[PDB]
Amino acid sequence: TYKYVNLREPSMDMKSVTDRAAQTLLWTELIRGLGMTLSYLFREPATINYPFEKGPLSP
């Protein structure tokens, strides 16, 4: 079917080059990656402590 992993260079001229250069000069996308686990901290953990709570099973 072919999905293709290669993007064949997203940058071309002026507008497409400068924004791709801005993320490599400072960070931006790493701060975007930093914010990915920020929301993960905010949501409740799906944790079960054994001596009191028990896990799901089958008949």
Q: Which residues contribute to the site for other proteins (CB under 8 A)? A: 11, 13-14, 17-18, 21-22, 24-27, 30, 33-34, 37, 40-41, 43-51, 54-55
Q: How far is the CB of 44 from other proteins (least distance, A)?
A: 6
CB nearer other proteins, residue 1 or residue 6: 6
CB nearer other proteins, residue 3 or residue 55: 55
Q: How far apart are CA 49 and CA 51, in angstroms?
A: 6
Q: How far apart are CA 15 and CA 20, in angstroms?
A: 9
- Dihedral Cα 36, 15, 12, 6, nearest 10 deg: 10
